[PDB]
Amino acid sequence: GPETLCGAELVDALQFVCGDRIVDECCFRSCDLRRLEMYC
Amino acid sequence: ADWLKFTKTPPTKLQQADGATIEIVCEMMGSQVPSIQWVVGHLPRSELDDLDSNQVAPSAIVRVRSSHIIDHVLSEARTYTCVGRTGSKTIYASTVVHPPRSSRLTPEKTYPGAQKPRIIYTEKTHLDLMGSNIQLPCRVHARPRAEITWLNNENKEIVQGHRHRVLANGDLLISEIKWEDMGNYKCIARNVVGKDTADTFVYPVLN
């Protein structure tokens, strides 16, 4: 659906992963874990 | 794989008011599809072994939120613990709930009457590979029992079809996810006396 909502909801997930365990790109087109990962 | 962590960990202690329903929320993120379950009291650590299926499925990443509703007045402090499992990993967070100093209601008896639905088990984020299948839950606490309806990313209601069905337990099954699928799906849980809703974000990842 909306690019905005995807981005909001994307960062909300990403917030957790990067610390321990671009948004626009992957909200407009499907990315893969490698690219998504380069959020940190 | 394999990893598992909390994203919303419950507070360790709570103070019950007289007559008021507590909802302990625990939320977590991890590889594949984490499973949460709650236990009451002190469980010896050896005791899990309480796992419910150990069946081999995906490279998905899920963020799943489960809540425990206490709707009766405790006559004595009690602990509720939520247990997370996925792959070879297990984690947990415990909360002690403390009874009121004084109470107008009977201890240990469930507040009577109807009750607004509450969605107690739901996925926040569910990322999986293209063409894979995903099954998004919605579980509920409701008296009377609650009807479940789902909407798609465009916010249209979902009806049964070749790629979408809602299962008997309210989970929504989406088959062969395509990029057109990415978005939010909303579970609407409803009864005579009210409603609740939850939102799940589906990101179909590439190759």
Author numbering:
A (entry chain B): 1 to 21, 43 to 61
B (entry chain A): 30 to 85, 89 to 239
What does the study report here?
The human IGF-1:Imp-L2 complex also reveals a dimer that is very similar to DILP5:Imp-L2 quaternary arrangement (~0.89 Å rms between Cα atoms of these complexes), and the overall IGF-1 and DILP5 Imp-L2-binding modes are very similar as well. However, a higher resolution of the X-ray data allowed here an unambiguous tracing of the IGF-1 Gly1-Cys6 N-terminus that corresponds to a partially disordered N-end of the DILP5 B-helix. The IGF-1:Imp-L2 complex confirms the nature of the hormone:Imp-L2 interactions observed in the DILP5:Imp-L2 complex. The IGF-I R-like state is stabilised by a firm anchoring of the hormone Gly1 NH2-terminus onto Imp-L2 surface by 1Gly-NH2—CO Met214 hydrogen bond (3.2 Å), and close Van der Waals contacts of IGF-1 Cys6–Cys48 disulphide with the side chain of Imp-L2 Met214. Hydrogen bonds between Impl-L2 Asn216 -ND2 and -OE1 Glu9 of IGF-1 augment the conformational stability of this region. Here, the N-(1–30) and C-(Pro236-Leu238)-termini of the Imp-L2 move apart, contributing to the expansion of the id-β-sheet surface by accommodating the Asp160-Met162 peptide as a more integral part of this β-sheet. A hydrogen bond between hydroxyl of Tyr235 and peptide carbonyl of IGF-1 Cys52 is formed in this process as well. Moreover, as the CysB7-CysA7 disulphide in insulin adjusts easily to R-state α-helix, its hIGF-1 counterpart—Cys6-Cys48 cystine—isomerises in this transition, pulling Cα atom of Cys48 by ~2.7 Å, and bringing the whole Cys6–Cys48 bridge into a close contact with the Imp-L2 surface. The importance of the Imp-L2 C-terminus in insulin-like hormone binding is even more evident in the hIGF-1:Imp-L2 complex, in which the 51–53 linker of the hIGF-1 A-helices is hydrogen-bonded to the Imp-L2 by 52Cys CO-HN Leu238 (2.8 Å), and Ser51 OG-OC Pro236 (2.9 Å) interactions. Here, we show that sole protein-protein interactions, unlike the insulin organic ligand-induced ones, are sufficient to facilitate and stabilize a full (B1–B19) helix formation in IGF-1 and DILP5.
Imp-L2 can bind human IGF-1, IGF-2, insulin, and DILP5 with nM affinities, it counteracts insulin signalling in Drosophila being essential for resistance to starvation, while its overexpression leads to an extension of the lifespan. Here, we report the crystal structures of the Drosophila Imp-L2 protein in its apo-form, and in holo-complexes with insect DILP5 and human IGF-1. The three-dimensional characterisation of the Imp-L2 IBP in its free and hormone-complex forms revealed its fold and hormone-binding mode that are entirely different from, and unrelated to, IGFBP-1-6. The apo-Imp-L2 consists of two, similar, immunoglobulin-(Ig)-like fold domains, each of them with two-sandwiched layers of ~6–7 anti-parallel β-strands.
